RNA sequence: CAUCACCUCUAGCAUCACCAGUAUUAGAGGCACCGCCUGC
């Protein structure tokens, strides 16, 4: 009883949580064990996790310290294992607080798929996993297809995809402004040779530029011409599905 | 094949062992590894990768004096030689290693931390966070694996409840039980890297043979080919 | 640990018994009353098997503990083949020892006057030292092996020239092949020395004692210099089977019973085989220290006392071209405790007969440069091997 | 063709190759030293 609560506040003491975090790390368990909530909580400090951002993610999802102590373990040896650690998984947690819910097949496959189907080395997918948390929850035929769309149709090659953040987007607006374009004739998909006849916009000028001000610097249109585009895209996309 | 691996010693012994080149030849005589054959003879010198190891008659913490640091033909790190009480073995010299220094191994485990010597071995547990370290081991008993590298060194990172993260080389976490021994500093041979081969001879003098002359347009991302999609299948390609 | 010895190259398990052998009241159909092996049948189990008779080729040892001979307590054996790792400072611990360098003033002094040189001694030893390393053999560079010896057996044969001048040079001859034993402890260890190969020059006569009664008094107030952590008892042949005796190598009545100076040669082409400067004088000086105690034991008994008449034994030490000596003085047969009355021993390191020798001449650009002959000739080192030899006899 | 030099890719580990080795390492490759200039 009291070695146990001796403990509990000592331990937090010593990996630099402060007094109002310590706290609170009480009152956020709800029926958790003591040493399961120490073994939670040093699992996090072990990753090289800050105690500011751990009192954070804890304090938004409390199903982190109801986990099994094996799971948790096995999943920070497998976390290390893939390039996450101190500073990076920070990224991660707050975009994607499932990560240690989900099964561990389900990351393989999509670790797997960006490195064997897509081909990205292990120092991208890193990268692309801290930056855009978002490939995990997105299924794997939809990232797959979206990959593919840059780098053949658009030809944009691997390391400008990581690097553009190209991944987080949403497919549909990928698809939306990247024919607009194509078929404004201000894209040029690249030949055999990767030569293009007019320089293709940047690719943050497409994705990360507003729809307003994205029409205004490159596409050179009115507003109301791209709306009836997107109906018009739409019925095609729909279309496509059902006719394949 | 008739091959029988020269690795059949049982005692360690400070005597240079002879041994038998591979060629890249597994045990059924075929080429498994290409590029190997070939070079000057060595004799390996039996490395006691396991620092805290006392002796029959004796336990606990002993000390050893360094008799000489010689070069080791098998590792890319020098070796020296140590005495430690009736009896000398092999282990692998740290950056500043000289004749006649005295280094200590122990597996005690104190409440502070203590004064980190380069070369003396102590648990991860009795180290101060941030020492460089090298020749770590997984767990208690396993010897030395890591960290063996002429010039490499981890880093002790954290340590929480009875284990410890340990930095490797390759900026790669690992983490091990705060009961490991490991050295204290760098290891020898820190300006191996900064050699200057010379010539294609001397690569021939290390057991090393040409690579093959083959033009492999197969490569990381050469070889392997993504799939198109039957969508993008029509894009893949058009003519200029 | 990582353990030595690959699994492939150790012997194999044999193979698991055929299951007939687990069924309790089945006899197992064999191939042992077929005398040969077949697949279709069952491996019979063969009782262990006895030769029955004496057999000295096929012989096989009891184990270890079954012999006679066998105790608890360690005995370390020194040899010639025993290579301390600290040199004189790890055998003067051993032995209870003083060092003090250079030769005695009394032995320098029977060559300090012309009348005991010898006629022509720098020519002789010269051709002492051209025929051992040139003249020698039929090939042109003779190896160690063979010039070590010889370099050394002329020598004494050179000084044992002067007996015209010194008739007491008739009551001493050269004994090859003399072993010797000597057994003692220090600090609850239990030692002993087994000195073999060389030249023993034995002497009817014992050698004088050195230093004197006040001096050797003197040498309580000395303590032995310690070399922690390695242990005094590094790189010996740390024994379980052995027998505490006793032996001078001779039985009683030999007419030669006083040891004079023990001979040591490195006779070995390889480098890594033969014993550094500081190994070298080590094995000296406990070659020494067992032959004197052979002599204590013997004639004052296995008793533990300061002796009263200290035993004094002579011991050279050679490369072929490197001389180290030693005047080795037995002053007590008490050596468990490090306290009291210590031995003493002059020594003399790195004495160089010659710097170099050349074989052939050194031609460069059609120019001999070197001629054929030793290098560097130091006739005063030729001078104290004198001394020693005729130390008790002038 | 190979070649030092440079560069890319893969791998955090032991009892038959690699290796009785451990990322200053090993393997799979490109190019052909060095020096200057350049991408990022
Ligand atoms: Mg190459
Ligand atoms: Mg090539
Ligand atoms: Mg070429």
């Known amino acids: 009883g009291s070695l146990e609560l001796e403990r509990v506040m000592s331990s937090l003491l010593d990996m630099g949580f402060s007094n109002a975090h310590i706290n609170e790390l009480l009152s956020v368990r709800r029926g958790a064990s003591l040493q399961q909530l120490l073994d939670i909580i040093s699992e996090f400090i072990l990753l090289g996790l800050n105690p500011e951002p751990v009192c954070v993610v804890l304090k938004k999802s409390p199903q982190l310290l109801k986990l099994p102590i094996m799971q948790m373990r096995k999943r920070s040896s497998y976390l290390q294992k893939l390039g996450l650690g101190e500073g990076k998984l920070k990224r991660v947690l707050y975009c994607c607080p499932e990560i240690f819910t989900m099964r561990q097949q389900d990351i393989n496959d999509t670790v797997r798929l960006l490195k064997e189907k897509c081909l990205f080395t292990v120092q991208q997918v890193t990268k692309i996993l801290h930056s855009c948390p978002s490939v995990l929850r997105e299924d794997l035929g939809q990232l797959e297809y979206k990959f593919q769309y840059a780098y053949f149709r658009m030809g944009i090659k691997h390391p400008d995809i990581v690097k553009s953040e190209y991944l987080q987007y949403s497919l549909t607006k990928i698809k939306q402004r990247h024919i607009y374009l194509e078929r404004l004739g201000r894209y040029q998909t690249p030949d055999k040779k990767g030569q293009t006849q007019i320089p293709n916009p940047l690719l943050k000028d497409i994705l990360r530029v507003s729809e307003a001000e994205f029409l205004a610097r490159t596409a050179c249109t009115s507003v109301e011409e791209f709306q009836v585009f997107k109906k018009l895209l739409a019925r095609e996309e729909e279309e496509s599905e059902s006719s394949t | ?240 | 640990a990582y353990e030595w010895g690959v699994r492939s190259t150790r012997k194999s398990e044999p193979p698991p018994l055929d299951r007939v052998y687990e069924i309790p009241g089945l006899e197992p159909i064999t191939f042992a009353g077929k005398m040969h092996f077949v697949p279709w049948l069952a491996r019979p189990i063969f009782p262990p098997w006895d030769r029955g008779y004496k057999d000295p080729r096929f012989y096989r040892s009891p184990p270890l503990h079954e012999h006679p001979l066998y105790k608890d307590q360690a005995c370390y054996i020194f040899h010639h083949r025993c290579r301390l790792l600290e040199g004189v400072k790890q055998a003067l611990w051993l032995t209870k020892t003083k060092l003090i360098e250079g030769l005695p003033e009394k032995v320098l002094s029977l060559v300090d006057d012309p009348r005991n040189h010898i006629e022509n001694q720098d020519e002789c030893v010269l051709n002492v030292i051209s025929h051992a390393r040139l003249w020698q053999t039929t090939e042109e560079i003779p190896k160690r092996e063979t010039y070590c010896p010889v370099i050394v057996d002329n020598l004494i044969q050179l000084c044992k020239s002067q007996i015209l001048k010194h008739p007491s040079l008739a009551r001493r001859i050269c004994v090859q092949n003399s072993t010797f034993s000597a057994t003692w402890n220090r600090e609850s260890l239990l030692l002993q020395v087994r000195g073999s190969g060389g030249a023993r020059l034995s002497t009817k006569d014992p050698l004088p004692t050195i230093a004197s009664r006040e001096e050797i008094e003197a040498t309580k107030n000395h303590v032995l210099e310690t070399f922690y952590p390695i242990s005094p008892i590094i790189d010996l042949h740390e024994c379980n089977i052995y027998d505490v005796k006793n032996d001078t190598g001779f039985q009683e009545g030999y007419p030669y019973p006083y040891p004079h100076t023990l001979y040591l040669l490195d006779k070995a082409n390889l480098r890594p085989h033969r014993l550094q400067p500081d190994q070298l004088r080590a094995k000296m000086i406990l070659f020494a220290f067992g032959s004197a105690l052979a002599q204590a034991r013997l004639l004052y008994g296995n008793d533990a006392k300061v002796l009263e008449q200290p035993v004094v034994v002579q011991s050279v030490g050679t490369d072929g071209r490197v001389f180290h000596f030693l005047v080795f003085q037995l002053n007590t047969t008490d050596l468990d405790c490090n306290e009291g009355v210590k031995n003493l021993a002059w020594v003399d390191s790195d004495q160089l007969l010659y710097q170099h020798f050349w074989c052939l001449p050194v031609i460069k650009k059609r120019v001999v440069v070197e001629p054929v002959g030793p290098v560097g000739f130091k006739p005063e080192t030729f001078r104290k091997f004198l001394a020693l030899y005729l130390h008790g006899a002038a």
């Open chain 2, 1 to 240: 094949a008739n091959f029988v691996s020269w690795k059949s010693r049982t005692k360690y012994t400070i005597t240079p062992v002879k041994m038998r080149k591979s060629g890249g030849r597994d045990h059924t005589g075929r080429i498994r590894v290409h590029g190997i054959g070939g070079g000057h003879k060595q004799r390996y010198r039996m490395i006691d990768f396991l620092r805290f190891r006392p002796e029959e008659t004796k336990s606990g913490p002993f000390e050893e004096k360094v008799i000489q640091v010689r070069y080791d033909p098998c590792r890319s790190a020098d070796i020296a030689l140590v005495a430690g009480g009736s009896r000398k073995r092999w282990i692998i010299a740290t950056e500043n290693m000289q004749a006649g220094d005295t280094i200590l191994n122990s597996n005690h485990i104190g409440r502070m931390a203590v004064a980190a010597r380069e070369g003396d071995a102590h648990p991860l547990g009795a180290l101060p966070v941030g020492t460089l370290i090298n020749n770590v081991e997984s767990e208690p008993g396993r010897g030395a694996q890591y960290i063996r590298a002429a010039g490499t060194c981890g880093v002790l990172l954290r340590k929480v409840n009875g284990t410890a993260i340990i930095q490797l080389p390759s900026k790669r976490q690992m983490q091990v039980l705060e009961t490991c021994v490991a050295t204290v500093g760098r290891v020898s041979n820190v300006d191996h890297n900064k050699r200057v081969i010379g010539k294609a001879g001397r690569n021939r003098w290390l057991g090393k043979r040409p690579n093959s002359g083959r033009w492999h347009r197969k490569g990381g991302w050469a070889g392997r080919k993504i799939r198109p999609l039957p969508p993008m299948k029509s894009y893949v390609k058009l003519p200029s």
